[model samples]
Structures are given as C-alpha cells and as structure tokens.
Target: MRVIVVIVGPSGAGKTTLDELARKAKEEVPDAEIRTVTTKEDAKRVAEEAERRNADIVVIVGPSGSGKSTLAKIVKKIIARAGAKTIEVTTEEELRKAVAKARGSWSLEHHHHHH
Candidate 1:
C-alpha cells in the first residue's frame, strides 16, 4: 500500500536525514509529503500547513522506540478534532484500506469557512 509518511523529531534527530532515503525509494513514486517539526508549537503549525496545502495525510516518523508512537497517537486525535481525517499507517501494507475509510468520514469538513 502506498502512503505519505511525515518525519518528525527533535533537532539533530534526523527527520531530514531519513527523508533523503525515502525520497529516493522509487522513481515511480510521486514522493511523500513529509512535514518535519522541531518544536512543540511546530506540531500545530505543521498540521495547519498540511490543511492549508490540502494534504490527505500526515505521518510522523522517527527512530524506533523514540516515543514517536506516543506523539503520533495524541496528534492524530487532535487532527481529527479539527475536522480532518487522520490516517495512522504504522504498517505500510494497511495504507490503502485505512485511508479509504478515513476519507469517507461523514463529518469531514472540506475546509474552514467562516462565512
């Protein structure tokens, strides 16, 4: 299953470092929409950026056993609360099925329109 994985971690934690590897994965792949966050505030900022840019999913990847999973759990809920579909693809093979269901969420607000 194809999926967009965002790499997030503290400074010098190699968020950008891993991106170089993922980007070069396949010539056929369109490229992953990775968002690297450096601060606590950056998470909210990056989520807004993803919405502003119409990103379908945001994945926060980091070193194994680095507390990345915990942050992902919390952030995913926050994004859902903001009226967007959040797909957490821990395993690559489940992307297609999971994102499909998330996209069909009836409560998904296309955009934040205040009119």
Candidate 2:
C-alpha cells in the first residue's frame, strides 16, 4: 500500500525496533512511508503529523502491551474524531492487511487544498 505508517513511541521503546517489518513492508509495497517517533514532542505530535501526512495508519507503541492498547484507544479517539478512519488489530497479519487495504483505498482520495 502507498500509505504512511507512523510508528510512535517514546525513546527506547520498540516502535523503531520494527525496522525489520518496515523494511519488509517497503520491499513488499514500494512507496510505504515508514516514520519513527523517538522524542516526547514527536510522540505527542502524532495527531498533527498524521493529518499532515494524510496517514492511512498511525500505529502507536507503548512501554508494554496493556499500556500500548490504552494509548492506542486514546489516540484513535483523537484522530477518528477529526474524521479519519481508525481500527485496531490483534494479529500482525491483520495489521498488514489493514495497511494494504488502506493503501489501496486511501491513495485514491484527494487531500490537498489550495488556499
């Protein structure tokens, strides 16, 4: 999918650790935008960044499993309430499919506005 994936987390978390998966996804789907958030400001800036990138998927990673889930929910509400599509997946395979499908669909939408 020609979509942007913003993997967000604090420094030392496993967010950027998904380099292998990001690399593989890039190999599988050219034009995959893989971004990492390592600083506190960047992590908090996810919403604005996602909107600016016209993100198809914004994946947030936390210190642990439950913490990640909770953070995802809060982030989802913030983004989705702004009229973006949001989803949660339990499996890595499901996550892949979501990204692929979004890439197929989202690439068609025009998000530019000239003022």
Candidate 3:
C-alpha cells in the first residue's frame, strides 16, 4: 500500500527541521512515504496530489490556530471513506503514531492481497 503524509500549517511549523527525523525513525519500516506540507493554501494541492497518486493514507499536520483540524475533519470525510486513512496531527509524536497505524493497516491489506 502507498501512503502520503501531508503536513499543513505555516510553512512546516519546524517540520523542515525534522525533515530527516521521520526518515531516521522509520528506517526499518517498509512502504511508508512520510511528507509534510505546511501551507494551508497548499492543502488543496496535497489532496489533489494524494488522489492522483492513489495514496492509501494521508496525514495532515498543522498548528492549533491554523484551522487544520477542521480542514482535516472535512478531508477525512472525503478521502478517508474511500479506504484511505486521513487525519490531522499537531505534534511529532502524533504524527508518528498516525503513520504507524496507517502503516499497520496498509501492512494488513497488502498482506491479505498476497494470499
């Protein structure tokens, strides 16, 4: 299963600093593509990109005042119902957990496809 992590807010909200953090943390994991888009204006672009790429999971991250939670809720209703896991997170830990869960689900789905 393919996945896309779309982080939204005011230009990463320090995500650019943690760019390599996720990679190092998930180095042992497989088939998970973690990315962040910190701009609210690019939120739509992220959705379109995820759709175009047929992503299995899309994670949206943002700050509290950025209106990202509401945005994520709406996005969840749309893409999530299609079988993709969509959610929004504010902290690095939440992001990790979200990705891990998505990865787990993808693992199960992909494994089932093998049999």
- Which numbered prediction scores highest in lDDT against the true structure? 3
Give per-residue CA lDDT, model 2, range 85-107, as digits (tens): 65543345565655454443455
- Residue-by-residue lDDT tens digits, candidate 1, 1-115: 2224454554424645645735653333464355555555666676656666555554544443346454554456556665555665443556455545554342254445564
Provide the overall lDDT of each model, using Cα atoms, as 2-decimal numbers.
0.51, 0.52, 0.56
Tens digit per residue, CA lDDT, model 3, 21-51: 4565347435555554444435555576677
lDDT of candidate 3 at residue 94, scale 0 to 100: 68
Ranked candidates, highest TM-score first = 3, 2, 1
Of candidate 1, the 10-residue stretch with the lowest lDDT total is 1-10
- Candidate 1 lDDT for residue 90: 41
Q: What's the CA RMSD for each of the models?
A: 8.1, 6.9, 4.5
The parts of candidate 2 lying over 4 Å away from their true place are 8-17, 37-41, 56-65, 91-115
Q: In TM-score terms, which candidate is top?
A: 3
